[PDB]
Each structure stands twice: as structure tokens, then as C-alpha cells.
Design a protein around this ligand. Structure first.
Ligand SMILES: CN1CCN(C(=O)N[C@@H](CCCONC(=N)N)C(=O)N[C@H](/C=C/S(=O)(=O)c2ncccn2)CCc2ccccc2)CC1
Length: 215
């Protein structure tokens, strides 16, 4: 595998969002993966809607939280693969309250037909990520609210609590690292991102990794 990857530099990744006081990070993770799998599929960079997931995906629990695998599953099964634009199903859950489901007013912004579930193996996750792009990942973010910058190397890693996006890594570095999109504003972390150490299952990042498949 290449010694370093950052899918952002190829412009594959959308602007860093804001989930609000709402445990909708599973939605932000998933949607971010979709935005990226849809870009790389030859299509233009389009902002997609987490609100669709939060309000409509009943297989998960809205502002109370959820899984990404279920998000993907639901999109493909109940929503026939269709994911709406963000502009036409905008986020209205910045206050821990999620609007009910609406079925008119929107516009389809992407298609996925399934998703894949990655080996609990950091290196394969990495290789794959080099070949196919950004990966939704579940993580322990317990030590994260105190992260200002750098390669965090002392992660509490015991229970998975968060949903974020792997956009790349680096292996040449002194401390090898992952490169991670967060849905807490760009005013958090490294302009909305965090790097953690690659190689030790920091934050249980090798655990639940998956990605929507566009085509
Ligand atoms: C049955 N059960 C319980 C609910 N659930 C779940 O919560 N999953 C996580 C995703 C991690 C994926 O894998 N995890 C594992 N396999 N164990 C989730 O949705 N976490 C959200 C946001 C937290 S946040 O950091 O983004 C945040 N919230 C509020 C303000 C700022 N930041 C947690 C949701 C939540 C937690 C406490 C209070 C409110 C909301 C799936 C399985």
C-alpha cells in the first residue's frame, strides 16, 4: 500500500459538518461515506442528507444514536438505494430533537446498491481505503473531547460510542496515523479533523468499519 493517503486532496471529501447537540454521528459518518463513494464513482461532489437518516431510518434511533451498517442497509432496502441531496432534506436536528419523516420536497443526490463490511484489520482497512476511498468507522471517542491537535496516541479504547470517517492515513510518519473526519465543527480538533495512531487499534477503530458501495 502507498505510504500515505488523503482523499481530501483529490477533493473527495465534503466540508466538515455539525451534528448539533444530537447523537446523529452515525448518520454523519454514513452520509460522509456516501458522499465520498458517490464522488469517486465519477459523479460530482454533492452534499447529501443526514436528516433523511435521522428522521426516516426507523432501524436506528435518530438523535439517540445508531449504526452505520444499518443506515446503509436501510437506504438500500427501504429507500431503494436512493439518498437525497442535503439541500432538499436539510438538517433540522441541531437541538437533540429530530423532525418526523417527510416524503415530498426532496431531490435524489446519489445511489448505492449495498455496502461492504471490512476485516477487523487496520492494514487491510488501510489498503482498501487506498483503493476505494473513505470508510465509515465506529470508535471510542471518550478521550476525544480534550483533543486540540496532533497524533493522539493514548486513546481510551473500551466501548464504541461514536461514528466518524476515515479519509486517509500516513505510514511514513514518526507515529503512523489515521486521518479522521469528525462531525463536530471545524472549530474542533485539527480544523474538524483528528489524527490518531495507526497500528495499535487506537480507539477500537479496526472494529466496526464499513462503506457504502456505489455500483
Ligand atoms: C442499542 N444500541 C444503542 C444505541 N447505539 C449507538 O448509540 N451507537 C453509536 C454509534 C457507534 C457504532 O458502534 N457502536 C457499537 N457497536 N457498540 C452512536 O450513535 N453514538 C452517538 C452520538 C454521540 S456524539 O459523540 O456524536 C455526540 N452526542 C451529543 C452531542 C455531541 N456529540 C450516541 C448517541 C447519544 C448518546 C448519549 C446521549 C445522546 C445521544 C446503537 C446500539
Amino acid at each position: 500500500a502507498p505510504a500515505a493517503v488523503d482523499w481530501r486532496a483529490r477533493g473527495a471529501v465534503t466540508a466538515v459538518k455539525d451534528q448539533g447537540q444530537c447523537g446523529s454521528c452515525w448518520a454523519f459518518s454514513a452520509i460522509g461515506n456516501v458522499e465520498c463513494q458517490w464522488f469517486l464513482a465519477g459523479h460530482p461532489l454533492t452534499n447529501l442528507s443526514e436528516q433523511m437518516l435521522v428522521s426516516c431510518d426507523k432501524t436506528d434511533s435518530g438523535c439517540s444514536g445508531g449504526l452505520m451498517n444499518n443506515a446503509f442497509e436501510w437506504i438500500v432496502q427501504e429507500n431503494n438505494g436512493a439518498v437525497y441531496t442535503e439541500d432538499s432534506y436539510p438538517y433540522a436536528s441541531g437541538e437533540g430533537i429530530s423532525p418526523p419523516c417527510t416524503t415530498s420536497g426532496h431531490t435524489v443526490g446519489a445511489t448505492i446498491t449495498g455496502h461492504v463490511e471490512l476485516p477487523q484489520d487496520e492494514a487491510q482497512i488501510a489498503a482498501w481505503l487506498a483503493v476505494n476511498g473513505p470508510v465509515a468507522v465506529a470508535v471510542d471517542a471518550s478521550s476525544w473531547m480534550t483533543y486540540t491537535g496532533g497524533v493522539m496516541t493514548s486513546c481510551v479504547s473500551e466501548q464504541l460510542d461514536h461514528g466518524v470517517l476515515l479519509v486517509g492515513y500516513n505510514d511514513s510518519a514518526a507515529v503512523p496515523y489515521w486521518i479522521i473526519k469528525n462531525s463536530w465543527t471545524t472549530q474542533w480538533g485539527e480544523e474538524g479533523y483528528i489524527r490518531i495512531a495507526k497500528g495499535s487499534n487506537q480507539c477500537l477503530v479496526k472494529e466496526e468499519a464499513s462503506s457504502a458501495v456505489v455500483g
